[PDB]
Design a protein around this ligand. Structure first.
Ligand SMILES: [Hg+2]
Ligand SMILES: [Hg+2]
Ligand SMILES: [Hg+2]
Ligand SMILES: [Hg+2]
Lengths: 105, 103, 106
């Protein structure tokens, strides 16, 4: 029984976000994906301010599967450079955690 | 006073608002934020489920953490809320003072 | 040589406010990317009545070296100098993304 972690990744739209989630679930690299639509990203690129629609993905997994999950997401990105960050979890519901660990075989 | 962010999931905005109001009244959280319209994907019994959900983001202090996790768990139909606690390393000092001024 | 990253959460009332705020902190190189999430409602007691209010949740990505200046700027822009502002530590991951967030800021 398994420490958890929350992985944030950005997708350009709902269909991409959905398909991504499906794949990493199928591979048992995450137990649950949460997808938040409607977001805007702003950032400079090559000297210009960009403003883009996004879906914020929130992926729940254990510290044992974190590197492979990260590897998988980076493999699917068109330029192998996903906006991908890991936040530490300092506590779960231990029953939800039991399910999370069980889901990952 | 240190603060934490608690994440939890509710099936619809109506139960999510009810639960927010209750934990705020019991002074287990200072602020509860709700984002409906989320999609959650996961496996059940070998088939992929896809449901709409409301993401909850609850702000509280470490000294109120356990008691929050407990009213939340009691409250969940099967007693297994999707509940995850994130550490906060810093922030606004005046905001944080107000967080603690609840209790 | 890359610095650690952080996530800064800040709350804004609406898209116009949040987008003006993001543009200014970006132009000043205090954050590398700002994500705005509309659709949030917050509930809290204030003077001491239960309020419910619509919000835009801001997620700002920056380095530990620029954290304090970012906090200071956002605070200064807030109409009461008291922004709902929290910092979360990042423990990993994508090295190219991290290299870009660093290059963005100097
Ligand atoms: Hg889930
Ligand atoms: Hg993969
Ligand atoms: Hg309760
Ligand atoms: Hg400023």
């Amino acid at each position: 029984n398994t420490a958890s972690v929350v992985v944030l990744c950005t997708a350009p739209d709902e269909a991409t976000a959905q398909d991504l989630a499906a794949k990493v679930l199928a591979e048992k690299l995450a137990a649950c994906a949460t997808l938040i639509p409607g977001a805007t990203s702003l950032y400079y690129w090559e000297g210009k301010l960009e403003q883009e629609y996004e879906v914020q993905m929130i992926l729940k997994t254990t510290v044992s599967h974190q590197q492979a999950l990260l590897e998988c997401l980076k493999s699917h990105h068109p330029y192998q450079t996903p906006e991908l960050l890991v936040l530490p979890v300092t506590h779960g519901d231990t029953d939800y955690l039991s399910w999370l660990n069980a889901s990952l075989r």
